[PDB]
Design a binder for this molecule. Structure first.
Ligand SMILES: [Fe+3]
Ligand SMILES: [Fe+3]
Ligand SMILES: [Fe+3]
Ligand SMILES: [Fe+3]
Ligand SMILES: [Fe+3]
Ligand SMILES: [Fe+3]
Ligand SMILES: [Fe+3]
Ligand SMILES: [Fe+3]
Ligand SMILES: [Fe+3]
Ligand SMILES: [Fe+3]
Ligand SMILES: [Fe+3]
Ligand SMILES: [Fe+3]
Lengths: 247, 247, 247, 247, 247, 247
């Protein structure tokens, strides 16, 4: 496929142009016009980029790319390293940030719900869907449940949460700032990827179970799902590569 | 002492006025004019406030108070509980944010250096000092040391760091984003409180040992040091309370 | 019944003579010729033995007796205490090892399948049957299931196993070494009693859920079944005693 | 350094030739001749192997390599993915088994004693040293101490062990079979990595505290000490990676 | 020694007259005037009696004799068999109930504290001493310490008990009703022998770890200690016999 | 329905007035006059109370309520928490104790017999019915049957019981003290909820099998049955909640 057709194909599937973001979504670093083999991961790290080269990929797709608002434009250190590995090999780089968090089918938020057994019921705010566990459980068992489906032990704070958690709201990644709004809505538990010092008081003082289940662990779902979707809806050859990151 | 005198006292000691902050520093919630009994802690959570009411405190002093730039002014939920508790009991709340991180003697940054046995040697940027462990050791050993000193296991990522750590830089709290600027400066390890998804690629791609030693865990030093400084320079009865937060 | 007659009755029921074992199967320590009260258990330990004496047993039958290939014939310490307890009281000691692991009806392997609700469908190797859970479930669920039916928390390694377990192979006791053979056959889970250091990499690298359910825990099934079989098929008074052992 | 030079340096330091073993010690898989960057780990699992490739290691050195006595020579499944990863990247694999268990200074056995605070006083059998805790404690406390020093809860069996443990014997890894020998020598406790059905009866009937502290957890000592010894005695850049394993 | 002399010896040693209870303390069934060989056990069961006859005892001492308040005085069934075994053989039966629970040195309560490493520091109520573990551990581990020390898995309930138990109160036998009183006093755990339906609610609603460690299991200490005291303070030949009882 | 009409409806169905009891039967704590939503359970524990408040219940009905003869009338600790939860929410508390154990259709005794397949044939004494299993089974088979129908492993002491049990008597809850009376009557097995030290001797010395199947476990029957009886003969909305109690 042509690098600019793939950009178009996914941009429309995710209704990407319509979403205001922190970074440019779509083709971020141009490469060869003709794409056939694609490598994908959560983040465009040096490690992911070296694999794309060893595997001979023509394009790489990530949920976290570069050119984030407010960062220095200069190309030195890490950025020179990464950009050279791409440019020198004519590898195309694509990144989809928020559109890839929110899409109803393929998004990180939707894939987490399905992975954790949550029936999605609505949305509190743009990136904060709510729903209920198809099998409500005490706060401790929910932590082991998360741990087991995600392959990572979450930080779990539930000193004052309800007996059983049924109603849950979540946001993958660094969504901890959304705990107060999920508390005002009324949930038994708020799930996200990272944690902050104030997030813990929000949990205790408002009576809900909090789970920080990993930034990387909660953000494999969307990019992974957009990979299967490209394998099923086109002839491109795409491979999702999970490169661990404990955060 | 008069609540406004004690604000002026800390203010001049921390050279607070000169520092631009994300929140007001000094008296944040006025109470009884005469302050004698004082409770301090990292954050003005409901839990500290209840301890101040039980202990009959006249003031509460913290590293993290209220009225952060950009939050809603409205007072409901946790804010109403916290402010009712302070206002209805005439308790003064004072908070000092950056000044309590930066002070060379009393600051969170300098006390962590002392606690971990690091000789301060300069600063890379305003909230980022650098120096050297007076007893260089490999990264794993530094991890164990940080954990015995702070009473908490830190996240350590050192797969590509030197075999011995000598030169270090650090920022207590949520200073993870300073990791790149420390790498440019040249250090073997960077220590801060929290960690984000991107922090890990920085540790890895620039070859330094990274430790996320805990937000609360790393910001007990300053308010604790200041509380002793008040006990030794005034007749006030100041009691520092450490209410555990895992983040 | 006569001691030698009870021996041949059981020998023929488990078709024992045809099986090459690591120890003698049948009467191992001769007692009084006439047997009427029998005490049974997983292993002929001093605690079972002391119970047989306290209950006036004429014979004791176990899955794990004595005289294993390679052990010193000498009789000191433990063996002295155990053999004297048996010989001085005229108590017959009988043990059936591999024949009590494989019998299609009474064997530990078959009993463990009924205990856990697995439909047996074939065998990969002599002590390695396979089958399917009549209720396919995720690994965490199977872990809890095993714990409830066995009264003991198994060690579960499922990092790379399928979302749902349905095809399973198992071998009670020290059968960890059979995991690769099962993995080549194609199963979703492998269950056994003990675990070794290499077992963990076999499970992770071959994509299956592995459970070390307890050597003692998984081996109460055969001897208990044989005890029940003896009370139903002869007039002896046989009492099975479970003496806990966490390994 | 040349690969074959490394082999001889370590062989001579461990007196490797004179020890008969269940597997070959030294260079197990040949790779590029010039070795400068080395990755070490407990076992040459796929996981350590992928970490060696990601860090651009030239050699990997482990306590557990391949080619055990009796294992099939055919290269299929995990052996193929393992060997391909090594041979295709020209990485050298070295493995030292019993020599790395017994070395008086660097070995797993000697390293456990130091870690647990036991003064070594002699040897019961080649891989079974004995000594005394410098700080004798009751069995319950010895279990907590082994758990804090190894970062893993051990299985403890002490139903008939002495009030206080002082004389101790041990053998990292799968050395449970030595427990009887330790009981004849005469000790208060015996410590190893794994547990078997039989080990428990041995502990109970001989009057000692038994602890199975983890195969893996008891064997990072030797390979880590040997890495530090290579960093101090050569210009190679050696890094130990601890890949967790619960058994 | 004369039966009436032994009665008076123990009577004065445990200050028996002063204590009122549910049954007569002292000689309950008179026998042979001259007492030289004694058998002792927790309870005057047919099974202990049978051992006294087999052993040629002149006397039996227990913690639980006959003639409890409200019991029918008629002698049939079990009472006839027991009284016959005693009278026909001229065997003296002595029993000490509460005096043998409370004696500061020899009583069941003091003896369980020595057995479990608890430093006695006082008394909450007459049969309820309190103290502190010299080895503070989590609830789960205390369960395991109790099980190893008494040879019986206790029922442990600590869903809402403190992370670490240190202050403990306890009463051997059927001391479950004292749990609310230990709670008011203020303890991290309470230990008794039996358990009732309401006990569990008291443990959970009062935030403490509760253990029903076994009636028989916790009441061998006193009678065994009295037997040792007798052997060391007279020329009587005394043997304490543990006849198992799971309650 | 009015709270007093519901009281009279159940009192007459259970012929409650005519039974002497250890606690008041009927309306124990008055709340709102109009009852439509009812929660029931075995005991009015804080856990059940919190569940009725969460479900918006109007009345709570139990087998074990409050105000047992001999208890302090003082309202402190658990009693204040419980009563405040009922009174502050205008929730009525009803309790039926002996009438709910004895009712021929709905009582605990009759329901356990139906659950266990026992044909009721008479009564030995008031709370002690007798009958026969359809067909006679060995003690071990009956212990597994109890375990499978009740979901909890019972304590079974059968050392001297007959080879097959057919005739059984039983009393749910704390009815161990009825064993001798049943033994006198003549049964093959006695079943109750709890066990005491002295119950084991009755079972051994009187030749019967004894099963302690759990206080809570055997007392869910009548309250469940009464709740279904209420949903079938009135338009009340009644929900029975089983909150596990291992005792
Ligand atoms: Fe993200
Ligand atoms: Fe995201
Ligand atoms: Fe901070
Ligand atoms: Fe700060
Ligand atoms: Fe076995
Ligand atoms: Fe076996
Ligand atoms: Fe090993
Ligand atoms: Fe080894
Ligand atoms: Fe007692
Ligand atoms: Fe007692
Ligand atoms: Fe009851
Ligand atoms: Fe009842």
């Amino acid at each position: 496929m042509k690098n600019t057709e793939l950009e178009q194909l996914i941009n429309e599937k995710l209704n990407s142009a319509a979403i205001s973001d922190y970074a440019p979504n779509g083709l971020q670093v141009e490469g060869k016009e003709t794409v056939q083999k694609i490598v994908t991961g959560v983040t465009a790290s040096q490690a992911l980029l070296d694999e794309a080269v060893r595997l001979g990929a023509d394009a790489v797709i990530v949920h976290h790319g570069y050119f984030w608002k407010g960062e220095s434009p200069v190309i030195r250190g890490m950025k020179r390293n990464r950009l050279k590995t791409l440019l020198a090999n004519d590898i195309n780089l694509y990144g989809w940030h928020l559109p890839l968090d929110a899409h109803p089918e393929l998004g990180n938020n939707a894939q987490l719900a399905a992975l954790l057994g949550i029936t999605v019921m609505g949305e509190i705010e743009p990136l904060v869907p709510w729903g209920e566990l198809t099998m409500p459980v005490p706060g401790l068992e929910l932590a082991s449940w998360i741990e087991a489906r995600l392959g990572r032990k979450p930080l779990w704070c539930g000193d004052t949460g309800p007996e059983v958690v049924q109603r849950v709201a979540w946001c993958t990644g660094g969504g901890q700032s959304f705990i107060d709004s999920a508390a005002r809505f009324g949930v038994d538990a708020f799930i996200t990827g990272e944690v902050s010092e104030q997030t813990i008081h929000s949990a205790r003082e408002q009576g809900l179970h909090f789970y920080a289940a990993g930034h990387h662990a909660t953000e494999r779902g969307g990019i992974r799902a957009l990979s299967e979707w490209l394998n099923e809806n086109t002839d491109l050859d795409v491979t999702f590569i999970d490169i661990p990151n404990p955060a």
